[PDB]
PDB file of C-alpha atoms (C1' of nucleotides) and ligand atoms in Angstrom:
ATOM      1  CA  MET A   6      26.714 -28.386  27.207  1.00  0.00           C
ATOM      2  CA  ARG A   7      23.317 -28.493  27.709  1.00  0.00           C
ATOM      3  CA  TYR A   8      21.672 -26.276  30.431  1.00  0.00           C
ATOM      4  CA  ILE A   9      18.946 -27.747  32.637  1.00  0.00           C
ATOM      5  CA  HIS A  10      17.088 -24.135  33.199  1.00  0.00           C
ATOM      6  CA  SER A  11      17.607 -20.808  31.717  1.00  0.00           C
ATOM      7  CA  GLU A  12      15.037 -18.293  33.161  1.00  0.00           C
ATOM      8  CA  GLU A  13      14.190 -14.552  32.460  1.00  0.00           C
ATOM      9  CA  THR A  14      11.456 -12.546  33.968  1.00  0.00           C
ATOM     10  CA  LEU A  15       9.690  -9.370  33.045  1.00  0.00           C
ATOM     11  CA  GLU A  16       8.070  -6.575  35.111  1.00  0.00           C
ATOM     12  CA  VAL A  17       4.591  -5.823  33.716  1.00  0.00           C
ATOM     13  CA  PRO A  18       2.936  -2.481  34.641  1.00  0.00           C
ATOM     14  CA  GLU A  19      -0.444  -2.701  36.346  1.00  0.00           C
ATOM     15  CA  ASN A  20      -2.190  -0.799  33.668  1.00  0.00           C
ATOM     16  CA  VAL A  21      -1.392  -3.144  31.053  1.00  0.00           C
ATOM     17  CA  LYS A  22      -2.986  -6.311  29.933  1.00  0.00           C
ATOM     18  CA  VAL A  23      -1.040  -9.320  28.709  1.00  0.00           C
ATOM     19  CA  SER A  24      -2.292 -12.288  26.807  1.00  0.00           C
ATOM     20  CA  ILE A  25      -0.564 -15.279  25.254  1.00  0.00           C
ATOM     21  CA  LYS A  26      -2.889 -17.742  23.568  1.00  0.00           C
ATOM     22  CA  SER A  27      -0.422 -20.282  22.685  1.00  0.00           C
ATOM     23  CA  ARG A  28       2.852 -18.334  21.941  1.00  0.00           C
ATOM     24  CA  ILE A  29       1.147 -15.320  20.161  1.00  0.00           C
ATOM     25  CA  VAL A  30       1.677 -12.475  22.412  1.00  0.00           C
ATOM     26  CA  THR A  31      -1.046  -9.820  22.714  1.00  0.00           C
ATOM     27  CA  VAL A  32      -0.307  -6.587  24.744  1.00  0.00           C
ATOM     28  CA  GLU A  33      -3.262  -4.204  25.331  1.00  0.00           C
ATOM     29  CA  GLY A  34      -2.430  -0.809  26.915  1.00  0.00           C
ATOM     30  CA  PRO A  35      -3.420   3.063  26.999  1.00  0.00           C
ATOM     31  CA  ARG A  36      -2.044   3.426  23.628  1.00  0.00           C
ATOM     32  CA  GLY A  37      -3.745   0.640  21.773  1.00  0.00           C
ATOM     33  CA  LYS A  38      -3.014  -2.958  21.288  1.00  0.00           C
ATOM     34  CA  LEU A  39       0.004  -4.805  19.619  1.00  0.00           C
ATOM     35  CA  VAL A  40      -0.067  -8.385  18.504  1.00  0.00           C
ATOM     36  CA  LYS A  41       3.533 -10.466  18.215  1.00  0.00           C
ATOM     37  CA  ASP A  42       3.941 -13.909  16.917  1.00  0.00           C
ATOM     38  CA  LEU A  43       6.505 -16.127  18.439  1.00  0.00           C
ATOM     39  CA  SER A  44       5.922 -19.803  17.416  1.00  0.00           C
ATOM     40  CA  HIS A  45       9.449 -20.170  15.955  1.00  0.00           C
ATOM     41  CA  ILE A  46      10.934 -20.349  19.684  1.00  0.00           C
ATOM     42  CA  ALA A  47      10.399 -23.226  21.869  1.00  0.00           C
ATOM     43  CA  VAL A  48       9.846 -21.280  25.294  1.00  0.00           C
ATOM     44  CA  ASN A  49       7.530 -21.526  28.146  1.00  0.00           C
ATOM     45  CA  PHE A  50       5.716 -18.908  29.960  1.00  0.00           C
ATOM     46  CA  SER A  51       4.364 -18.760  33.324  1.00  0.00           C
ATOM     47  CA  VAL A  52       3.056 -16.427  36.127  1.00  0.00           C
ATOM     48  CA  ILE A  53       5.495 -15.898  39.069  1.00  0.00           C
ATOM     49  CA  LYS A  54       4.214 -13.337  41.405  1.00  0.00           C
ATOM     50  CA  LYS A  55       1.456 -10.890  41.254  1.00  0.00           C
ATOM     51  CA  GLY A  56       2.335  -9.191  37.614  1.00  0.00           C
ATOM     52  CA  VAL A  57       5.641 -10.652  36.549  1.00  0.00           C
ATOM     53  CA  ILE A  58       5.743 -13.112  33.500  1.00  0.00           C
ATOM     54  CA  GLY A  59       8.418 -15.656  33.416  1.00  0.00           C
ATOM     55  CA  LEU A  60      10.483 -17.098  30.298  1.00  0.00           C
ATOM     56  CA  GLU A  61      12.143 -20.251  30.852  1.00  0.00           C
ATOM     57  CA  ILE A  62      13.832 -22.814  28.401  1.00  0.00           C
ATOM     58  CA  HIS A  63      14.647 -26.173  29.745  1.00  0.00           C
ATOM     59  CA  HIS A  64      17.192 -28.020  27.752  1.00  0.00           C
ATOM     60  CA  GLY A  65      19.228 -25.634  25.582  1.00  0.00           C
ATOM     61  CA  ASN A  66      22.579 -25.638  23.739  1.00  0.00           C
ATOM     62  CA  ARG A  67      23.698 -21.966  24.067  1.00  0.00           C
ATOM     63  CA  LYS A  68      21.870 -21.363  20.862  1.00  0.00           C
ATOM     64  CA  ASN A  69      18.354 -21.690  22.154  1.00  0.00           C
ATOM     65  CA  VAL A  70      19.528 -19.880  25.392  1.00  0.00           C
ATOM     66  CA  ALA A  71      20.680 -16.814  23.266  1.00  0.00           C
ATOM     67  CA  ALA A  72      17.071 -16.548  21.634  1.00  0.00           C
ATOM     68  CA  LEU A  73      15.731 -16.446  25.463  1.00  0.00           C
ATOM     69  CA  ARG A  74      16.862 -12.981  26.078  1.00  0.00           C
ATOM     70  CA  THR A  75      15.986 -11.806  22.667  1.00  0.00           C
ATOM     71  CA  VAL A  76      12.444 -12.704  23.425  1.00  0.00           C
ATOM     72  CA  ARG A  77      12.338 -10.980  26.567  1.00  0.00           C
ATOM     73  CA  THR A  78      13.462  -7.654  25.115  1.00  0.00           C
ATOM     74  CA  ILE A  79      11.069  -8.039  22.211  1.00  0.00           C
ATOM     75  CA  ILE A  80       8.046  -8.635  24.596  1.00  0.00           C
ATOM     76  CA  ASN A  81       9.183  -5.793  27.144  1.00  0.00           C
ATOM     77  CA  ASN A  82       9.190  -3.403  23.723  1.00  0.00           C
ATOM     78  CA  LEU A  83       5.424  -4.378  23.238  1.00  0.00           C
ATOM     79  CA  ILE A  84       4.710  -3.198  26.761  1.00  0.00           C
ATOM     80  CA  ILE A  85       6.760   0.003  26.175  1.00  0.00           C
ATOM     81  CA  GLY A  86       4.951   0.611  22.705  1.00  0.00           C
ATOM     82  CA  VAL A  87       1.476   0.587  24.228  1.00  0.00           C
ATOM     83  CA  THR A  88       2.546   2.794  27.315  1.00  0.00           C
ATOM     84  CA  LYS A  89       4.974   5.419  26.202  1.00  0.00           C
ATOM     85  CA  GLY A  90       5.141   4.749  22.347  1.00  0.00           C
ATOM     86  CA  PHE A  91       8.125   5.125  19.985  1.00  0.00           C
ATOM     87  CA  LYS A  92       9.258   8.513  18.568  1.00  0.00           C
ATOM     88  CA  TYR A  93      11.953   8.703  15.840  1.00  0.00           C
ATOM     89  CA  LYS A  94      13.666  12.087  14.760  1.00  0.00           C
ATOM     90  CA  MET A  95      15.351  12.401  11.447  1.00  0.00           C
ATOM     91  CA  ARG A  96      17.412  15.414  10.174  1.00  0.00           C
ATOM     92  CA  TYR A  97      17.918  16.482   6.727  1.00  0.00           C
ATOM     93  CA  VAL A  98      21.485  16.877   5.614  1.00  0.00           C
ATOM     94  CA  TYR A  99      22.619  18.580   2.494  1.00  0.00           C
ATOM     95  CA  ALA A 100      25.202  21.063   1.018  1.00  0.00           C
ATOM     96  CA  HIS A 101      23.781  22.834  -1.906  1.00  0.00           C
ATOM     97  CA  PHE A 102      20.166  21.317  -2.830  1.00  0.00           C
ATOM     98  CA  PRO A 103      17.299  21.907   0.006  1.00  0.00           C
ATOM     99  CA  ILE A 104      15.192  18.464   0.338  1.00  0.00           C
ATOM    100  CA  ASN A 105      11.724  19.299  -0.123  1.00  0.00           C
ATOM    101  CA  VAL A 106       9.310  16.667   1.393  1.00  0.00           C
ATOM    102  CA  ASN A 107       5.646  16.252   1.786  1.00  0.00           C
ATOM    103  CA  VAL A 108       3.826  13.589   3.828  1.00  0.00           C
ATOM    104  CA  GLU A 109       0.107  12.694   2.979  1.00  0.00           C
ATOM    105  CA  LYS A 110      -2.089   9.825   4.549  1.00  0.00           C
ATOM    106  CA  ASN A 111      -3.365   7.690   1.690  1.00  0.00           C
ATOM    107  CA  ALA A 112      -7.118   7.447   1.947  1.00  0.00           C
ATOM    108  CA  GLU A 113      -7.678   3.928   0.314  1.00  0.00           C
ATOM    109  CA  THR A 114      -4.926   1.991   2.288  1.00  0.00           C
ATOM    110  CA  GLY A 115      -4.535   4.203   5.517  1.00  0.00           C
ATOM    111  CA  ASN A 116      -0.874   4.306   5.578  1.00  0.00           C
ATOM    112  CA  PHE A 117       1.230   7.316   5.372  1.00  0.00           C
ATOM    113  CA  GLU A 118       3.352   8.079   2.248  1.00  0.00           C
ATOM    114  CA  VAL A 119       6.404  10.194   2.397  1.00  0.00           C
ATOM    115  CA  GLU A 120       7.445  11.811  -0.822  1.00  0.00           C
ATOM    116  CA  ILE A 121      10.809  13.086  -1.219  1.00  0.00           C
ATOM    117  CA  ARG A 122      11.879  15.657  -4.090  1.00  0.00           C
ATOM    118  CA  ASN A 123      14.715  17.600  -4.804  1.00  0.00           C
ATOM    119  CA  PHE A 124      17.427  15.368  -3.725  1.00  0.00           C
ATOM    120  CA  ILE A 125      21.026  16.249  -4.909  1.00  0.00           C
ATOM    121  CA  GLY A 126      19.821  17.914  -8.087  1.00  0.00           C
ATOM    122  CA  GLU A 127      17.701  14.634  -8.866  1.00  0.00           C
ATOM    123  CA  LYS A 128      14.422  15.112 -10.582  1.00  0.00           C
ATOM    124  CA  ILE A 129      13.314  11.748  -9.773  1.00  0.00           C
ATOM    125  CA  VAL A 130      10.528  11.529  -6.998  1.00  0.00           C
ATOM    126  CA  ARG A 131      11.362   8.953  -4.062  1.00  0.00           C
ATOM    127  CA  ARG A 132       7.928   7.786  -2.746  1.00  0.00           C
ATOM    128  CA  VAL A 133       8.181   5.762   0.596  1.00  0.00           C
ATOM    129  CA  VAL A 134       5.174   3.885   2.036  1.00  0.00           C
ATOM    130  CA  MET A 135       5.131   3.906   5.725  1.00  0.00           C
ATOM    131  CA  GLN A 136       4.313   0.638   7.754  1.00  0.00           C
ATOM    132  CA  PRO A 137       0.670   0.326   9.222  1.00  0.00           C
ATOM    133  CA  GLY A 138       0.526   2.338  12.438  1.00  0.00           C
ATOM    134  CA  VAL A 139       3.220   4.555  12.001  1.00  0.00           C
ATOM    135  CA  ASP A 140       2.421   8.569  12.107  1.00  0.00           C
ATOM    136  CA  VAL A 141       4.660  10.948   9.998  1.00  0.00           C
ATOM    137  CA  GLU A 142       4.895  14.523  10.883  1.00  0.00           C
ATOM    138  CA  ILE A 143       7.250  17.411  10.095  1.00  0.00           C
ATOM    139  CA  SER A 144       8.609  19.033  13.120  1.00  0.00           C
ATOM    140  CA  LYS A 145       7.814  22.863  13.760  1.00  0.00           C
ATOM    141  CA  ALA A 146      10.052  23.477  16.668  1.00  0.00           C
ATOM    142  CA  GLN A 147      13.224  22.710  14.631  1.00  0.00           C
ATOM    143  CA  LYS A 148      13.824  23.234  10.807  1.00  0.00           C
ATOM    144  CA  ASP A 149      14.259  20.291   8.545  1.00  0.00           C
ATOM    145  CA  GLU A 150      13.382  17.256  10.720  1.00  0.00           C
ATOM    146  CA  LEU A 151      10.780  14.450  10.537  1.00  0.00           C
ATOM    147  CA  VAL A 152       8.996  12.684  13.378  1.00  0.00           C
ATOM    148  CA  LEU A 153       7.868   9.174  13.258  1.00  0.00           C
ATOM    149  CA  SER A 154       5.462   7.866  15.831  1.00  0.00           C
ATOM    150  CA  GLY A 155       3.697   4.636  16.527  1.00  0.00           C
ATOM    151  CA  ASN A 156       3.119   1.791  19.107  1.00  0.00           C
ATOM    152  CA  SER A 157       5.225  -0.771  17.148  1.00  0.00           C
ATOM    153  CA  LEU A 158       9.040  -0.436  17.361  1.00  0.00           C
ATOM    154  CA  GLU A 159       9.549  -2.686  14.110  1.00  0.00           C
ATOM    155  CA  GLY A 160       7.097  -0.421  12.427  1.00  0.00           C
ATOM    156  CA  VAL A 161       8.676   2.739  13.501  1.00  0.00           C
ATOM    157  CA  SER A 162      12.325   1.582  13.348  1.00  0.00           C
ATOM    158  CA  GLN A 163      11.705  -0.114   9.625  1.00  0.00           C
ATOM    159  CA  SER A 164       9.797   3.119   8.364  1.00  0.00           C
ATOM    160  CA  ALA A 165      12.657   5.295   9.324  1.00  0.00           C
ATOM    161  CA  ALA A 166      15.213   3.100   7.908  1.00  0.00           C
ATOM    162  CA  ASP A 167      13.426   2.972   4.553  1.00  0.00           C
ATOM    163  CA  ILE A 168      13.572   6.598   4.360  1.00  0.00           C
ATOM    164  CA  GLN A 169      17.305   6.912   4.900  1.00  0.00           C
ATOM    165  CA  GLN A 170      18.062   3.941   2.633  1.00  0.00           C
ATOM    166  CA  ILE A 171      16.039   5.485  -0.324  1.00  0.00           C
ATOM    167  CA  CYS A 172      18.273   8.834   0.110  1.00  0.00           C
ATOM    168  CA  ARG A 173      21.572   6.919  -0.895  1.00  0.00           C
ATOM    169  CA  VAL A 174      24.160   8.699  -3.100  1.00  0.00           C
ATOM    170  CA  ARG A 175      25.467   6.969  -6.319  1.00  0.00           C
ATOM    171  CA  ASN A 176      28.839   7.236  -8.074  1.00  0.00           C
ATOM    172  CA  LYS A 177      30.054   9.710  -5.859  1.00  0.00           C
ATOM    173  CA  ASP A 178      32.518  10.026  -2.860  1.00  0.00           C
ATOM    174  CA  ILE A 179      30.036   9.378   0.212  1.00  0.00           C
ATOM    175  CA  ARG A 180      32.694  10.902   2.550  1.00  0.00           C
ATOM    176  CA  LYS A 181      32.195  14.094   0.680  1.00  0.00           C
ATOM    177  CA  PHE A 182      28.399  14.061  -0.234  1.00  0.00           C
ATOM    178  CA  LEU A 183      27.382  13.649   3.199  1.00  0.00           C
ATOM    179  CA  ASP A 184      23.573  14.217   2.130  1.00  0.00           C
ATOM    180  CA  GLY A 185      20.425  12.199   3.130  1.00  0.00           C
ATOM    181  CA  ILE A 186      17.571  12.064   5.902  1.00  0.00           C
ATOM    182  CA  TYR A 187      19.473  10.455   9.077  1.00  0.00           C
ATOM    183  CA  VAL A 188      18.118   9.334  12.267  1.00  0.00           C
ATOM    184  CA  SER A 189      18.507  11.447  15.402  1.00  0.00           C
ATOM    185  CA  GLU A 190      17.636  10.288  18.899  1.00  0.00           C
ATOM    186  CA  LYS A 191      15.469   7.196  19.387  1.00  0.00           C
ATOM    187  CA  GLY A 192      13.380   8.289  22.461  1.00  0.00           C
ATOM    188  CA  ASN A 193       9.681   7.607  23.333  1.00  0.00           C
ATOM    189  CA  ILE A 194       6.713   9.900  23.069  1.00  0.00           C
ATOM    190  CA  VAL A 195       6.127  10.216  26.663  1.00  0.00           C
TER     191      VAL A 195
ATOM    192  C1'   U B 163      10.542 -11.672 -66.565  1.00  0.00           C
ATOM    193  C1'   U B 164       8.150 -17.862 -70.091  1.00  0.00           C
ATOM    194  C1'   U B 165       2.922 -13.082 -69.158  1.00  0.00           C
ATOM    195  C1'   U B 166       7.383 -15.229 -74.177  1.00  0.00           C
ATOM    196  C1'   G B 167       1.810  -9.283 -72.734  1.00  0.00           C
ATOM    197  C1'   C B 168       2.907  -5.141 -76.171  1.00  0.00           C
ATOM    198  C1'   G B 169       6.298  -2.672 -79.180  1.00  0.00           C
ATOM    199  C1'   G B 170      11.356  -2.188 -81.717  1.00  0.00           C
ATOM    200  C1'   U B 171      15.100  -4.918 -84.376  1.00  0.00           C
ATOM    201  C1'   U B 172      18.996  -8.656 -87.269  1.00  0.00           C
ATOM    202  C1'   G B 173      19.466 -13.505 -90.641  1.00  0.00           C
ATOM    203  C1'   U B 174      17.137 -16.882 -93.150  1.00  0.00           C
ATOM    204  C1'   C B 175      12.105 -19.499 -94.537  1.00  0.00           C
ATOM    205  C1'   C B 176       6.961 -19.324 -96.063  1.00  0.00           C
ATOM    206  C1'   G B 177       5.491 -15.551-102.499  1.00  0.00           C
ATOM    207  C1'   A B 178       3.736 -10.599-102.340  1.00  0.00           C
ATOM    208  C1'   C B 179       5.322  -8.077 -97.525  1.00  0.00           C
ATOM    209  C1'   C B 180      -0.284  -9.047 -93.630  1.00  0.00           C
ATOM    210  C1'   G B 181       0.719 -12.700 -90.296  1.00  0.00           C
ATOM    211  C1'   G B 182       4.130 -16.145 -88.434  1.00  0.00           C
ATOM    212  C1'   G B 183       8.206 -20.330 -88.191  1.00  0.00           C
ATOM    213  C1'   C B 184      14.005 -21.178 -86.758  1.00  0.00           C
ATOM    214  C1'   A B 185      18.323 -19.350 -83.937  1.00  0.00           C
ATOM    215  C1'   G B 186      17.826 -24.875 -77.005  1.00  0.00           C
ATOM    216  C1'   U B 187      14.254 -17.971 -74.297  1.00  0.00           C
ATOM    217  C1'   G B 188      17.858 -14.709 -81.295  1.00  0.00           C
ATOM    218  C1'   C B 189      18.637  -9.816 -79.144  1.00  0.00           C
ATOM    219  C1'   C B 190      16.938  -4.696 -76.835  1.00  0.00           C
ATOM    220  C1'   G B 191      12.866  -1.326 -74.113  1.00  0.00           C
ATOM    221  C1'   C B 192       8.758  -1.265 -70.884  1.00  0.00           C
ATOM    222  C1'   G B 193       6.455  -5.222 -68.120  1.00  0.00           C
ATOM    223  C1'   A B 194       1.340  -6.538 -64.693  1.00  0.00           C
ATOM    224  C1'   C B 195       0.778 -10.795 -61.023  1.00  0.00           C
ATOM    225  C1'   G B 196       3.796 -13.781 -57.724  1.00  0.00           C
ATOM    226  C1'   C B 197       8.303 -14.163 -54.982  1.00  0.00           C
ATOM    227  C1'   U B 198      11.417 -11.008 -52.682  1.00  0.00           C
ATOM    228  C1'   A B 199      15.464  -7.136 -49.763  1.00  0.00           C
ATOM    229  C1'   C B 200      17.642  -3.297 -42.491  1.00  0.00           C
ATOM    230  C1'   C B 201      17.835  -2.425 -50.931  1.00  0.00           C
ATOM    231  C1'   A B 202      11.315  -1.834 -48.504  1.00  0.00           C
ATOM    232  C1'   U B 203       7.292  -1.427 -43.945  1.00  0.00           C
ATOM    233  C1'   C B 204       5.101  -3.077 -39.155  1.00  0.00           C
ATOM    234  C1'   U B 205       5.935  -5.313 -33.999  1.00  0.00           C
ATOM    235  C1'   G B 206       8.789  -7.295 -30.022  1.00  0.00           C
ATOM    236  C1'   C B 207       4.791  -7.404 -21.941  1.00  0.00           C
ATOM    237  C1'   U B 208       4.974  -8.212 -16.558  1.00  0.00           C
ATOM    238  C1'   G B 209       4.646 -10.956 -11.384  1.00  0.00           C
ATOM    239  C1'   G B 210       7.254 -13.504  -7.834  1.00  0.00           C
ATOM    240  C1'   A B 211      11.931 -15.966  -5.087  1.00  0.00           C
ATOM    241  C1'   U B 212      16.698 -14.433  -4.496  1.00  0.00           C
ATOM    242  C1'   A B 213      22.743 -13.394  -4.944  1.00  0.00           C
ATOM    243  C1'   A B 214      26.359  -9.606  -3.679  1.00  0.00           C
ATOM    244  C1'   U B 215      25.445  -5.470  -0.741  1.00  0.00           C
ATOM    245  C1'   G B 216      23.477  -1.654   2.353  1.00  0.00           C
ATOM    246  C1'   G B 217      19.878  -1.902   6.744  1.00  0.00           C
ATOM    247  C1'   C B 218      15.832  -2.860  11.319  1.00  0.00           C
ATOM    248  C1'   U B 219      14.774  -5.377  16.104  1.00  0.00           C
ATOM    249  C1'   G B 220      17.958  -8.056  18.947  1.00  0.00           C
ATOM    250  C1'   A B 221      20.926 -11.870  22.459  1.00  0.00           C
ATOM    251  C1'   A B 222      24.938 -14.719  22.953  1.00  0.00           C
ATOM    252  C1'   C B 223      29.084 -11.505  25.641  1.00  0.00           C
ATOM    253  C1'   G B 224      24.444  -6.271  31.591  1.00  0.00           C
ATOM    254  C1'   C B 225      28.634  -2.596  26.580  1.00  0.00           C
ATOM    255  C1'   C B 226      27.764  -2.996  21.571  1.00  0.00           C
ATOM    256  C1'   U B 227      26.142  -5.323  16.333  1.00  0.00           C
ATOM    257  C1'   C B 228      22.772  -7.050   9.377  1.00  0.00           C
ATOM    258  C1'   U B 229      22.282 -13.010  12.449  1.00  0.00           C
ATOM    259  C1'   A B 230      21.971 -16.681  16.262  1.00  0.00           C
ATOM    260  C1'   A B 231      15.922 -16.727  16.234  1.00  0.00           C
ATOM    261  C1'   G B 232      12.963 -13.187  13.151  1.00  0.00           C
ATOM    262  C1'   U B 233      12.840  -9.574   9.141  1.00  0.00           C
ATOM    263  C1'   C B 234      13.462  -5.065   4.896  1.00  0.00           C
ATOM    264  C1'   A B 235      15.252  -3.363   0.144  1.00  0.00           C
ATOM    265  C1'   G B 236      17.773  -5.380  -4.082  1.00  0.00           C
ATOM    266  C1'   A B 237      21.065  -7.455 -10.104  1.00  0.00           C
ATOM    267  C1'   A B 238      21.094  -8.129 -17.316  1.00  0.00           C
ATOM    268  C1'   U B 239      20.522 -13.635 -11.862  1.00  0.00           C
ATOM    269  C1'   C B 240      16.521 -18.280 -11.362  1.00  0.00           C
ATOM    270  C1'   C B 241      11.102 -19.479 -12.023  1.00  0.00           C
ATOM    271  C1'   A B 242       6.912 -18.089 -14.172  1.00  0.00           C
ATOM    272  C1'   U B 243       3.395 -14.997 -17.310  1.00  0.00           C
TER     273        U B 243
HETATM  274 MG1  LIG C 199      21.191  -3.079  17.411  1.00  0.00          MG
END
RNA sequence: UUUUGCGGUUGUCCGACCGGGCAGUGCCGCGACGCUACCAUCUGCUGGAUAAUGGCUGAACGCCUCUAAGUCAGAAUCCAU
């Protein structure tokens, strides 16, 4: 069954500027500006009433309608990113070997680089390069905790997952060796 | 090992024992050049795209979740250098 009209709406705060050239969405806010490309989905944008952006798909077969709500949340994530930002907390879990971590901003590229030494007995050094626009800090309030911050949820979430995926145990019972860096709550900066 | 290079030596033949001939390379020791042996010596690089799999954002299906749109890492795999 094809649907003659599917519609989603998104509230835009008054302190945020939203621009859609063709389908490339540019969001400018207090914390900076974010750009997202959506030229792979057939969707129409419009202004409904004084600060709300309407999204509609006109003839969808339940596989295009599904992508309608996905776009709405992605655009809403851009608005949230430039207003309240995204902050991920990650805790260190180990049994015998403390995990030694150092963070440093590369001067040539500008991206933070997370360097992990002393995994479970390991001598190898695990270097993870963060996505652009993500800031990495070691929390002082609580011991053994990383903090990743940035406007882009894709950048922050992918960066946190790269750290977790590189700290995987090999050839051991993973139900016993519960060692690694695992993502804690996923709140906002503000 | 036909360098038939030098030396040794056996049986005949060359007329006085120097130098050689023949025994299909007479036999033995050493033998340079050349050829040659994991029997000797030297040398044999790195992008990119992926598969399984583990993930991010995220609907369908107000909850969720690696997938549906998008996307990350990744094998002696495929392609190329
Ligand atoms: Mg999810």
